[PDB]
Structure 1
């Protein structure tokens, strides 16, 4: 009964260690506050020269004219506002009844539509109000076209079409794309949070750069070490709980066997080889931090192949994980020795 806790606490440590990304880990450093970057697994280590000439912006349209209040209907007829963003996006049509044709009503109407833009009212002073509509996301492709059918007055007040001769709205903020170069390669992007340009890298743009600036990606084993230390300690605690029945015996024996009888596609085929040694009397593992760091420094990915493997069928944490789930399941050996 009390050895369900021991096993679940260990299960957690084991899940934490069963992440391939630990073994491709890299950290980052930037020479400017102008940008920063986080990496995921399998990022390529090196100095990246970065230049940033333009930041991405989100379009914001604003009524050219003002109004004496927010309660009074602009339109004397029912009408349909149609918002059309760019980039192969379907248009959204919103009904605006006459009575809901006030700045308040238009605002709420737009916002409740969940159409990828946001509407809000600006009090510009002297009891005068402007409607303002901004695209939720930055980039040329998210710029808007607004049109109204039904009421000429509303259309005349709110409409925007770049190609049109006269527009009721004014471009307050121009939609624009981020424009950078990374290792002398021109990149354009919708967003200042660029995660689809460079592989396994999220690049965060904050300001235009000046001069020669660099993002550095370096190998990082610290994360994988912590995971391995916590795992070793969690297992050693589980063995203490055993010390403190055939169902217990089966779990204790199987876990011992699994850690003893390992298979691996890398050069590292046993725990010892990567620092961790197995005390013959108890079963409990004793990590050597020096010899572990070495193995990781030499071939981090190779260590990963032992600990994680393919994640589905192979790898220590994989097979232990499968066994723990099965023991802790409703049909498992533990739920039967409960009943």
Structure 2
């Protein structure tokens, strides 16, 4: 019922408010932005159309935060870069695949989680085909993997009025009552968010 406006010392963050947000000055220090994991094949193919697997296979995609594993069927015919990209994207597995032409007639496969957060980090495993498993597999606890981490999963980390706060997201509306905090950048020095009763 009670409306408020916000002002910020930096482009590093802004904020909007729901009703009944507490007016006043908030000291905000942002030390890390949330990041969505991206895994990229450490090796390349010379095209997007040649099958990589010789058998049909099953891709398992498992995220953290107690989410259900998704198993996708990939026929030998569809074990090409395009085939796998399409099969992942069509699965709606909370991850998204794309192809990168890195030049020199070489292509990489990238898989990115749709949501930022440590809990949105992912495991990828392929059963029923060695070549594809070793091309595309990723397990953080394995020494050799087909994927490398090109973008680390990461949580936002900030302090608000000296209270330490971690969050899966750079859009934070679950931490502070009736405030939504949007993090655009890590901060330096004293930065403040000002909330005034209308």
Residue 77 of structure 2: aligned partner: 99
The structural deviation recorded for 1:217 is 0.8
Shift of 1:42: 1.2
RMSD, matched Cα: 3.4
Q: Give TM-score, length-normalised by structure 2.
A: 0.99
Q: Which has the larger radius of gyration?
A: 1
Q: Which runs of 5+ in 2 are unaligned?
A: none
Structure 1 residue matching 2:132: 3-state secondary structure: helix
In the superposition, the TM-score normalised over structure 1's length comes to 0.58
**Residue-by-residue CA offset, 1:74-101 (whole Å, 9 max, x unaligned):** 0010000000000010000100000000
Query: What is the distance in 2 between the residues matched to 1:196 and 1:54?
Result: 18
* Deviation sequence 1:239-296 (CA, Å, 0-9, x none): xxxxxxxxxxxxxxxxxxxxxxxxxxxxxxxxxxxxxxxxxxxxxxxxxxxxxxxxxx
Q: Which has the higher contact order (CA 8 A, sep 6+)?
A: 2
Measured in 2, the distance between the counterparts of 1:176 and 1:48 equals 24
- Structure with a larger share of its residues in strand: 2
Offset at residue 70 of structure 1 (A): 0.2
* Partner deviation per Cα, 1:98-149 (whole Å, 9 max, x = no partner): 0000000000000000000000000000110000000001010000000000
Establish whether residue 46 from structure 1 lines up as the match of residue 21 from structure 2.
no
User: Larger % of helix: which?
Assistant: 1
* Superposed displacement of residue 24, structure 1: 1.1
Equivalent residue of 2:103, what SS? coil
Q: How far, CA to CA, are the matches of 1:212 and 1:121 in structure 2?
A: 42
Unmatched 5+ stretches in structure 1: 1-22, 220-338
Verify: 1:175 aligned to 2:165, yes or no.
no
SS of corresponding position for 2:84: helix
Partners of 1:150 and 1:25 in 2: CA distance: 59
Separation of aligned partners in 1, 2:20 and 2:142: 48
Q: Deviations over 1:16-62 (max 9, x none)?
A: xxxxxxx3111100010000000011111110000001111010000
Paired with 1:199 and 1:74, the residues of 2 have a C-alpha distance of 51
Deviating above 2 A after TM superposition, structure 1's stretches of 4 or more consecutive aligned residues are none
| Structure 2 SS opposite 1:105 | helix
2 CA distance for matches of 1:82 and 1:38? Answer: 39
Please state whether the residue corresponding to 2:77 is helix, strand or coil: helix
Q: Where does residue 160 of structure 1 map in the other structure?
A: 138
Q: State the alpha-carbon separation in 2 of the partners of residues 214 and 175 from structure 1.
A: 27
